[PDB]
Design a protein around this ligand. Structure first.
Ligand code: 032
Length: 261
């Protein structure tokens, strides 16, 4: 079993949430990230369900994917991954002052696309892709997280597709809805802002994005943004999930764009 024995893992600096739990800067002589799952009294049923999904994290291994190091049962259900010293992409873009050149802006997008391309190759739908789950490792490598517990909403609707928002299906999520979320990530990178800064009401954004009368303002992108990047971003943000490009052709046009400039 991959189960880390009790006591070997300790938590310290709290980061926050953290879908299906709470993440910490943990430790076992080597900085690791610990997600403390919100499960009080584990019944042997959901303990097995968590066991099986851990079994998935075992063989889902990629360079732009958060490395799964192990899990815990006692004293609390925890997911242990590697620690990214460069924090998350949301922090650098919206929470701090960091001179981001277009050079590495596009590169962050390229690594994020490949990480998502692998997840879709492994037939995994992320469902939570945002700049909060994009972590910058100290070796200047983008790491995607919060994709676990796939076979098992709050409270970030900025990255949610119009068809996901409404919603109409019990399972509205698809590979194409992951693309839209990536399209917002692209928007954050190029503009340097979260979408819908003008509108404050969360209830109104729900109504308007679902309606189709509210879209990210592509005008607020930086002047040094390549034009091929902009309309690619526009294709990812299209309302109908049918017309959205797949990650294979997303990754294709981005990496070929990097060698043009
Ligand atoms: C294999 C993947 C398992 S998963 O359940 O699907 N995903 C999963 C599992 C456990 C986690 F602890 C995390 C997670 O959140 C982080 C993982 N490494 C990090 N490094 C820095 C920050 C950070 C540092 C500083 C700021 Cl200011 C913000 C964030 C956040 C994380 C995670 F995304």
């Amino acid at each position: 079993d991959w189960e880390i024995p009790d006591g070997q893992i300790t938590v310290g600096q709290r980061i926050g949430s953290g879908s299906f739990g709470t993440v910490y800067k943990g430790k076992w002589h080597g900085d690791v990230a610990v997600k403390m799952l919100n499960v009080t009294a584990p019944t042997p049923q959901q303990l097995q369900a968590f066991k099986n999904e851990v079994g998935v994290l075992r063989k889902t291994h990629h360079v732009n994917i958060l490395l799964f190091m192990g899990y815990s049962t006692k004293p609390q259900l925890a997911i242990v991954t590697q620690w990214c010293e460069g924090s998350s992409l949301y922090h650098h873009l919206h929470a701090s002052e960091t001179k981001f050149e277009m050079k590495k802006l596009i590169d962050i997008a390229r690594q994020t696309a490949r990480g998502m391309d692998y997840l879709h190759a492994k037939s995994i739908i992320h469902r939570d892709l945002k700049s909060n789950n994009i972590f910058l490792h100290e070796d200047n490598t983008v790491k995607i997280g919060d994709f676990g517990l796939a076979t098992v909403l709050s409270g970030s609707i900025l990255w949610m597709a119009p068809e996901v928002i409404r919603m109409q299906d019990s399972n509205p999520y698809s590979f194409q809805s992951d693309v839209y979320a990536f399209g917002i990530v692209l928007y954050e990178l190029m503009t340097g802002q979260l979408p819908y800064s003008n509108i404050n009401n969360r209830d109104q954004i729900i109504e308007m994005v679902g309606r189709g009368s509210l879209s990210p303002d592509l005008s607020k992108v930086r002047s040094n943004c390549p034009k091929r990047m902009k309309r690619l971003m526009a294709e990812c943000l299209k309302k109908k999930r049918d017309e959205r490009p797949s990650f294979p052709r997303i990754l294709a046009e981005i990496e070929e764009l990097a060698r043009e400039l």
